[PDB]
Amino acid sequence: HPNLIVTEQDVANIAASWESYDAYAEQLNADKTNLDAFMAEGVVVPMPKDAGGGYTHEQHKRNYKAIRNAGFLYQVTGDEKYLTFAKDLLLAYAKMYPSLGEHPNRKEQSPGRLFWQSLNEAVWLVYSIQGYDAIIDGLAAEEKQEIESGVFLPMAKFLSVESPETFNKIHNHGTWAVAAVGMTGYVLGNDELVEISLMGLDKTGKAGFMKQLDKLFSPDGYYTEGPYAQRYALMPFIWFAKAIETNEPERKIFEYRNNILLKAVYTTIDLSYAGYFFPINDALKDKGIDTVELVHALAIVYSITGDNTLLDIAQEQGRISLTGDGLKVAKAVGEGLTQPYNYRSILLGDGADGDQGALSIHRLGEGHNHMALVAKNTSQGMGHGHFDKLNWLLYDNGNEIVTDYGAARYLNVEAKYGGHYLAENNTWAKQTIAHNTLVVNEQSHFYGDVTTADLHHPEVLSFYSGEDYQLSSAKEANAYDGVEFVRSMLLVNVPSLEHPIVVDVLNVSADKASTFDLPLYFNGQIIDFSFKVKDNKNVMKMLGKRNGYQHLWLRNTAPVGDASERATWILDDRFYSYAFVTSTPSKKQNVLIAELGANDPNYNLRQQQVLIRRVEKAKQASFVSVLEPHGKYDGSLETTSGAYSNVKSVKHVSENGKDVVVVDLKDGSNVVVALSYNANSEQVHKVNAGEEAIEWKGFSSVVVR
Amino acid sequence: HPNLIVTEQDVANIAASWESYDAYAEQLNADKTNLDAFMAEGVVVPMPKDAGGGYTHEQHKRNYKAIRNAGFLYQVTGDEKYLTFAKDLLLAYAKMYPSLGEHPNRKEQSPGRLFWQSLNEAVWLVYSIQGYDAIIDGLAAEEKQEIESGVFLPMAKFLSVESPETFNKIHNHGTWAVAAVGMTGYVLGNDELVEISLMGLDKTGKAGFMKQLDKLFSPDGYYTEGPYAQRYALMPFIWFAKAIETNEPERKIFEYRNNILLKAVYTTIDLSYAGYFFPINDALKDKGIDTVELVHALAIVYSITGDNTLLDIAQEQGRISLTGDGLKVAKAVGEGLTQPYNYRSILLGDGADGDQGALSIHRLGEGHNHMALVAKNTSQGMGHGHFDKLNWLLYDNGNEIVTDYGAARYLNVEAKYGGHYLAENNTWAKQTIAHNTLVVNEQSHFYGDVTTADLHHPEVLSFYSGEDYQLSSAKEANAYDGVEFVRSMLLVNVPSLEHPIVVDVLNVSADKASTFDLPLYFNGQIIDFSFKVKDNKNVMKMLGKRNGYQHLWLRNTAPVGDASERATWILDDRFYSYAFVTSTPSKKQNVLIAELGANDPNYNLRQQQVLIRRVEKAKQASFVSVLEPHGKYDGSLETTSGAYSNVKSVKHVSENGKDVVVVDLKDGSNVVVALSYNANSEQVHKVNAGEEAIEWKGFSSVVVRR
Ligand SMILES: [Zn+2]
Ligand SMILES: [Zn+2]
């Protein structure tokens, strides 16, 4: 002991060299200093009272971190004050725990004792057991016995046999539970606890850790609920794996399922941009790569693989794992071994077999602050999922440009409903109108019904990644009765332009005349519009009555027609121009500029603007657009250039269900995008685009003339 | 040569050691790389066509930087291609310039030729003449005469004798003009041009540089228009001074007016927080200490003084002056000589004599991310001034907390009205309602009349800075007919609390019963309010008809009364709680939550929220409040602590014009603030609060009672 997340040899290596690595030493010293301050407050173990974000909740969180850090610092420095503090905390817990019933403000579905919900109880155990592992050296037999019978065994029992619906769950809450109990199993030398964690309560392998490894990741290491859920699941997966590896290496856990755990870690990184995870489905916008689950996971994977490109990400994290694996990262960074991360455009198939729709991630450009397009053509993702089939996000210049709201929630802020999902999470954040995808008749996809949405996934039609252009194309046939829509999204490299451009083609057919809405949630300040806004007459009225529309104010409506229109905005030092045209038999076309905040008496919603393209009384529409990063603005040096869009216009023609988009540029050149929706790469196609005839092979073609 | 902003000795020093200093070398190499790329485009000198932010405007800007940079790099590297490019640009300018009339899209008030306004023309000359100075010794006599007779002399003549209304102006546009002409005079060895720059066109000293030094700064080096104008004026002041020093050291320009230029540089720094200038009056929110004027000025002042605390600020700038003076900064930093900047609480008297009201800057805490309260008790500042007497700003934790909008303008963005002031600059940004100060009957101070406002300044009643607390108190008796108001703002050190708290007391008396509004423009996301908002019925109406009110949407109203109320919000990793109570005979009082964006069809205005305290109908009110930073939110590590306010309530009592504020804390302790408005430090005062009697001496007292 220790022999779990750190080994005795790890401790010896850390003791020998931690002061030699500047960032590791700064990290370790910060922790030491902070713990010293916490210790001066004494041993403070309150009776459970408060739910999420409340005092007792955050106090017991502070204690599990203290137990773990104290144990580590005892091993590394030899200072008995850290042993004594960790010991005294655990003895206080051992005295208190046996008397605890259900938390007084418990969560209905999975209650805890120490905590309002059993989830945090599992986290407590994961951390606290490591601290215990690290202090066993300095404890008397009777102290071990008291702590083990007082808190560890009763808590392990609670989280396992007394909570079968969580422990046998094939879900990240199950992952946390089996990691907590299994790690306890390894530290305490309790084979039963280890076995039930690996193979479920009945030990058959129908549930448990091995089943979770098979079910909770696609073969490429993608977690269906999204990056936010993925990074959270990554800790109990990678820490229980680390524990299995240090105790039972013969199980070859890091080889399991074609190295699924390694793949899960790389995929977590590939679900981020400029340090932040793509905020799709339930997600908080401030969650990024310095989150501790990925800090630890990266160190573990670096230790296994020696992949020096991981060191690039490590530097971007600005936080290092205080472990033996972290020491290896610090050493390699200090030796100048860092290589750049190889960002790839990837198609991540959804579900355990990677066959339930997919998340497309298209990247173009050098370094971390490149251009990234995300096409969300994924399955539902259960109750965590948003009603946003074929949604998209755009990143550029280190910023989110075309955005996803994430969840309506304030993490661990008790005054915001105990840090839990707010009423507006369902009524705003999940709804289709809140996203950059098609809304029909002011109703959400699947009519906002999770049960229906869970039965369906989008059909991916094409994925292409080349030096000329990038493409994803997908079909949604099940979101509404008598409606089908297809969306193709492209990143096009135009040599004459500073930055790649997005081309978007969203086609819709409906049995009955409908309203079609396509929002664009943008980040930045409007410079100008090509269209004329109607006077709002000094009032903003709620946009609509239901399904998220009741949360939007209408700031202006602007009538539009056959010709393409433009909106240009600034964000930091770059301009963005959205050129858009909609082909439809209907003449009832209008642009709505809306702002978030109606039906929000509790001020839970952020300020946010949106450009909504609306067609009314239509059975068919082709929403076409271009998104163009351009120019420079430097407020510091007081300069600018290329502030005007280089797109003169956008035109669209559809013939025999095949699409042609012509982007006319200001220098007299043009870009032609052609879509056949036919996978046969050798099949020739022909479309009459007004004057000229367009001829191409394959699913798609892009030509710059 | 060179002998202006850099000297021959400077070049020697740089040549001997520039690659020894990492940051200096990195920036020099960056400039070199950028210039090489620019040079690959060839010599591109378009005929003048576009105004602010337009192509020709920004191209000629790129060119003046290129000429200066090329000159410098020629001197440092000895590479002739840099000489050749600087020469070729200037010869192209020499060919074009004599043919130029007024710019085709010229500014009415002060037209340029190369640029739409003469201001940018002066900047061009200031930069380009340094480039010329650096290459002149490598040019043939005929090339020198072509450049001098073709561009520099006619431009100097244009900016001076042909523009007497600008050249003789006691204003920073006059400073830019005299710097441009005077620097030209030194480089060309033309005594006439130097003399008229120093002493005005008629050489009497009624106008010119020396007069500007006397009139444009207070004795403490404060520029009346505000930090945004100060930093801009700082370049021609400090660079012309530098040129004067390298050519005529006997003038002792850096000693003039008790070291006014040195004080002006320090004051510029003292007008910043966490790298950004206080956005008072006409200001753009992205203007900060890395602005080149302060970069060069700081290096110059460091070279003169050897003040190692300036090195702390230089590091925060993240940009170094590529000069000999900048080399000394880089050297001193590399030698580990940096000391922390000594931030001071200061009273900056306004006007040339520092006697027209004042800008109070109160600072508390260590490092750069401390707490800073700004009390704007200043004169109008003429056309650039806002109608916001007794306005305040609060900074904390590296952020602006209680805010000032600045100007409605997008710098060099041609599509936003040629980068000029937008319609909403006058109708929104200048108006009193857009600020954190008293608004009477929905009209701005001085009824929004700049002529009236220019005649008056607030009366500073008290300024105190101690370990226990900080205070500014000021009176405004002229903003409205038959209205007088007094505001006292405090920063209070409460040992039991994590951060200092603001205490605010704003008293108003009016001859006629009036509506009183006190806005608070805050930065961050609302957590909760103690009050109960009325249902807005799914509509936001424009808040009022005139004077800035026409740009706000009413989101919610909520009734308030005798008991104090609270708003708590979050910004990054900290919470802020505003506890507030208003003493008044008024039957009704309301809190209005409003949002910016009404009457903004062109989307010129930013998203912004505001909490407005309204007294419906009264002759008197005392607006009392506490602003409290507290707690921690960490979204990365997923923890919180101290997220609830520690202020239980705030209570106010007035007796015989003397104020007592009691702040009750959740741990059962309290803070008592007493204000007598009597400057006699020995005078005893008594006010009956609850049943307790509050007794103290002096203008103010603050006691923390455990
Ligand atoms: Zn979403
Ligand atoms: Zn202002």
Side-chain angles (χ1 to χ4, degrees), chain A residues 53 58 61-62 65 228 231 286-287 290-293 319 410-416 525-529 533 536 538-542 553 555-556 570 575 593 595-597 599-609 633-641 644, chain B residues 53 58 61-62 65 228 231 286-287 290-293 319 410-416 525-529 533 536 538-542 553 555-556 570 575 593 595-597 599-609 633-641 644:
Chain A
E58 298 295 317
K61 288 166 60 173
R62 284 184 289 268
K65 298 188 181 68
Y228 188 82
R231 62 83 210 184
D286 59 354
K287 189 91 292 194
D290 70 1
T291 196
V292 299
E293 311 91 325
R319 174 172 287 151
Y410 295 82
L411 186 75
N412 303 321
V413 182
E414 185 169 63
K416 293 285 203 202
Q525 177 75 32
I526 291 296
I527 297 306
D528 70 320
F529 298 124
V533 298
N536 61 29
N538 311 326
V539 65
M540 299 207 298
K541 285 163 180 159
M542 175 178 73
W553 306 113
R555 188 167 156 172
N556 285 292
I570 187 168
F575 296 89
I593 305 154
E595 289 183 353
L596 192 61
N599 283 287
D600 185 26
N602 295 315
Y603 288 74
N604 299 338
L605 296 175
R606 296 187 300 279
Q607 283 187 304
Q608 174 68 49
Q609 295 181 328
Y633 162 85
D634 187 331
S636 173
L637 298 176
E638 309 201 354
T639 64
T640 192
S641 63
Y644 292 105
Chain B
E58 298 293 320
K61 278 165 67 172
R62 285 181 285 272
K65 295 185 183 72
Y228 185 82
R231 65 79 210 185
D286 58 353
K287 189 88 288 192
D290 70 4
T291 202
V292 298
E293 308 94 321
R319 175 175 284 150
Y410 293 83
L411 190 74
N412 303 139
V413 177
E414 189 170 54
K416 293 287 206 197
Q525 175 77 34
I526 291 298
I527 302 304
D528 70 321
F529 297 121
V533 297
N536 60 26
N538 304 331
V539 70
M540 299 216 293
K541 291 161 175 168
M542 181 180 68
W553 308 112
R555 186 170 158 165
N556 283 289
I570 186 173
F575 299 87
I593 315 303
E595 306 197 328
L596 190 60
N599 284 104
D600 186 28
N602 297 316
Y603 288 71
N604 292 333
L605 303 172
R606 296 188 296 277
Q607 291 191 293
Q608 175 71 50
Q609 295 182 322
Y633 164 82
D634 187 339
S636 177
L637 297 180
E638 313 210 347
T639 65
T640 60
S641 61
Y644 295 110

